[PDB]
Design a protein around this ligand. Structure first.
Ligand SMILES: *C/C=C(C)/C=C/C=C(C)/C=C/C1=C(C)CCCC1(C)C
Ligand SMILES: *C/C=C(C)/C=C/C=C(C)/C=C/C1=C(C)CCCC1(C)C
Ligand SMILES: CCCCCCCCCCCCCCCCCCCC
Ligand SMILES: CCCCCCCCCCCCCCCCCCCC
Ligand SMILES: CCCCCCCCCCCCCCCCCCCC
Ligand SMILES: CCCCCCCCCCCCCCCCCCCC
Ligand SMILES: CCCCCCCCCCCCCCCCCCCC
Ligand SMILES: CCCCCCCCCCCCCCCCCCCC
Ligand SMILES: CCCCCCCCCCCCCCCCCCCC
Ligand SMILES: CCCCCCCCCCCCCCCCCCCC
Ligand SMILES: CCCCCCCCCCCCCCCCCCCC
Ligand SMILES: CCCCCCCCCCCCCCCCCCCC
Ligand SMILES: CCCCCCCCCCCCCCCCCCCC
Ligand SMILES: CCCCCCCCCCCCCCCCCCCC
Ligand SMILES: CCCCCCCCCCCCCCCCCCCC
Ligand SMILES: CCCCCCCCCCCCCCCCCCCC
Ligand SMILES: CCCCCCCCCCCCCCCCCCCC
Ligand SMILES: CCCCCCCCCCCCCCCCCCCC
Ligand SMILES: CCCCCCCCCCCCCCCCCCCC
Ligand SMILES: CCCCCCCCCCCCCCCCCCCC
Ligand SMILES: CCCCCCCCO[C@@H]1O[C@H](CO)[C@@H](O)[C@H](O)[C@H]1O
Ligand SMILES: CCCCCCCCO[C@@H]1O[C@H](CO)[C@@H](O)[C@H](O)[C@H]1O
Lengths: 63, 221, 63, 221
């Protein structure tokens, strides 16, 4: 389970970094609507990511 | 991070799996060989598809979005191999294999076709895929599970674990289709690609590693 | 495990909704930097949320 | 969603737990009573603290941020009750109880003090809390686990499950402190509060429900 968890924990921060980069890039623009757009994507993406990680975990540490 | 960078990460992840599955299989007798070969095909095909996208090929403009043909072509080729692997564990016969591979192929064909359709009618194609997917899930958790339950303990256990991984995770793909570029485009192209890389890696390479880990244990008792 | 998962799945979308509301509220402002700020918080928050959900799951379906 | 709305959600969640723990305990003999009472204290205190914050009391301005005194006061009162519950399961003696409650109290006092300090030296106080927390974790997974391993199977199993919940989840709080208003303020006040509501609910009410579920099972065999 260990290798599974740090895989999950590490990919989450790596996904968060990608999402953050998208938000900062949109921020550099000065367009508020662009940032909202990148942010809505990041939020939906992170929610889906939970589903994936939870799915992976439930599937491997369940039976 | 650019799209091509993500595609390269996908290709490398798939290559690492492919190398692992090939080498693990070097220790395999007549009974286990086909499983290892199947895993190699699954991750190998995916590795090449990712390279194709990373090299900037198959990026198809559709209305005001970009659809990746090699993504859907990969799925058309590799998902029936995953269904095949599961069916082998379950102990299916040719007629049973035919049903699930057919249902699987309808999902992937419908999803690819829908992604390539500009108009609102692409959701009808999605819908056709979604219904076929519910049929596939039924087959996985019903009939195929019943077949698997007649086999050895170690085999039934691997089947259920891989079945659970597959049903839960494959169910996420249509939501990414709907929320991503092919649907309402609430996910950026980058987030869409990043989610699919991770998901593909778990459903192919994670799946394979779970199988590798179980195979070593069964052979070592 | 079921009641645990839909608890996790439902609280995630509820957290995503709160985060999204914060981003839209910042968007209504027209300030790009404000949106980046709300977005960075949402991303970090969603990453921490994965940790909580994963922690809960590992702890209950593990042994 | 406003802060007060989140605080009200916290209060309601804690009340629901408190009612559940009280009623579950109505079926309890001399040996189990103290556990149910402990759970009632834990969620009851938290419920009141949340009401206090929802009613707009204890919001303390510190430099350019807002710190919630009742949050830290809740923790000072309820975390030693959680440590007590764990110590009862583990079968600790008074001297062992004294050590872990002391380590626990240092964490909460340090964290509260640090949150109330405007200057950079608040991180020294955080640091003092963080070291004490590592000591508490050691005690939980070392000595306390050894003590628990001498008890019945059902008791050892509950201890490990609650120990794991506690160690993993409590470890998240200092990151929320660091990233939230008391630290570098990268989390908005709203996200900070929302995360803490969820986390408090799991560490108190989730903890209790896990215990309730185990208690029913042990008594029913
Ligand atoms: C290695 C790649 C894998 C396992 C791909 C799985 C993809 C699916 C399960 C896709 C399912 C879809 C639906 C159920 C609806 C139509 C949209 C699809 C094709 C994304
Ligand atoms: C019901 C509330 C619970 C279980 C609160 C737990 C809070 C902690 C474990 C806090 C730990 C902290 C550190 C380890 C460092 C200093 C900052 C703290 C107090 C947030
Ligand atoms: C794992 C599936 C989650 C899909 C996104 C849920 C939230 C959608 C809101 C629109
Ligand atoms: C080890 C191969 C690299 C895998 C990177 C996967 C990144 C997924 C996108 C987030
Ligand atoms: C350990 C095996 C190394 C050679 C495997 C080559 C697989 C390439 C797949 C394309
Ligand atoms: C530029 C548009 C052209 C799209 C052509 C698609 C290219 C083929 C993609 C193949 C991906 C799957 C690889 C499977 C074979 C091994
Ligand atoms: C759960 C996430 C929903 C995202 C929005 C999807 C909008 C279209 C949904 C249609 C799905 C069924 C197909 C209907 C065909 C007409
Ligand atoms: C997607 C919802 C499907 C509802 C059917 C539930 C079947 C449960 C089988 C046990
Ligand atoms: C063995 C019992 C049959 C389970 C049917 C599950 C239905 C799945 C619906 C999708
Ligand atoms: C708790 C286990 C979950 C198993 C899911 C299997 C069924 C998947 C249903 C989702 C199919 C996508 C269609 C979504 C339309 C909106
Ligand atoms: C107890 C079952 C053991 C499961 C081990 C397999 C865990 C797989 C983790 C995901 C790997 C995804 C691909 C990573 C690319 C390298
Ligand atoms: C569960 C702990 C996660 C804390 C946030 C990790 C990312 C911090 C980046 C700064
Ligand atoms: C059932 C009591 C209400 C609980 C709501 C918890 C919300 C946590 C913040 C996200
Ligand atoms: C079922 C018990 C109802 C009365 C419990 C009152 C608890 C209040 C806690 C403050
Ligand atoms: C406006 C600033 C004043 C802060 C006062 C703090 C109020 C007391 C908070 C009590 C929370 C814990 C409840 C425990 C007793 C039951
Ligand atoms: C992992 C998240 C880090 C967020 C930034 C925290 C910045 C301060 C960290 C200091 C922690 C140790 C205390 C040092 C005392 C001087
Ligand atoms: C926070 C990192 C602590 C490192 C010590 C690891 C102890 C492992 C015990 C087995
Ligand atoms: C029973 C073995 C002792 C485990 C010590 C764990 C150290 C935790 C470090 C924090
Ligand atoms: C895999 C199990 C994880 C158990 C964690 C127990 C140790 C917690 C260490 C974090 C303490 C917070 C200090 C962070 C400083 C940056
Ligand atoms: C197998 C162990 C059973 C664990 C059941 C307990 C799950 C608790 C879920 C979290 C509840 C948090 C508080 C909810 C407020 C109502
Ligand atoms: C990647 C590793 C997966 C290996 C899974 C093996 C599952 C099938 O098991 C194999 O089936 C043979 C009959 O065909 C029998 O000789 C044995 O049951 C076994 O070798
Ligand atoms: C909220 C429910 C938690 C109940 C956990 C009970 C754990 C302790 O178990 C109790 O200890 C008694 C001795 O003190 C004994 O009579 C029995 O072992 C049991 O009743």
């Amino acid at each position: 389970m260990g290798a599974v968890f740090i895989f999950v924990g590490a990919l989450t921060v790596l996904f968060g970094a990608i999402a953050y980069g998208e938000v900062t890039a949109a921020a550099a623009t000065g367009d508020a609507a662009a940032v909202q757009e990148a942010a809505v994507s990041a939020i939906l993406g992170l929610i889906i990511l939970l589903g994936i990680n939870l799915g992976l975990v439930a599937a491997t540490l369940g039976g | 991070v650019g799209l091509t960078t993500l595609f390269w990460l996908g290709a490398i992840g798939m290559l690492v799996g492919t190398l692992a599955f090939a080498w693990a299989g070097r220790d395999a007798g007549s009974g286990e060989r086909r499983y290892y070969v199947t895993l190699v095909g699954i991750s190998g095909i995916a590795a090449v598809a990712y390279v194709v996208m990373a090299l900037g090929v198959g990026w198809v403009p559709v209305a005001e979005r970009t659809v990746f043909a090699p993504r859907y072509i990969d799925w058309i080729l590799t998902t029936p191999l995953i269904v095949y692997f599961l069916g082998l564990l379950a102990g299916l016969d040719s007629r049973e294999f035919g049903i699930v591979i057919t249902l699987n192929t309808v999902v992937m064909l419908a999803g690819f076709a829908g992604a390539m359709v500009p108009g609102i009618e692409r959701y009808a194609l999605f819908g056709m895929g979604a219904v076929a997917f519910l049929g596939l899930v039924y087959y996985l958790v019903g009939p195929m599970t019943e077949s698997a339950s007649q086999r050895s303990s170690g085999i039934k256990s691997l089947y259920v674990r891989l079945r659970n991984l597959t049903v839960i995770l494959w169910a996420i793909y249509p939501f990414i289709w709907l929320l991503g570029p092919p649907g309402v485009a609430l996910l950026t192209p980058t987030v869409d690609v990043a989610l699919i890389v991770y998901l593909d890696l778990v459903t192919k390479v994670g799946f394979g590693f779970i199988a590798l880990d179980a195979a070593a244990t069964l052979r070592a008792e």
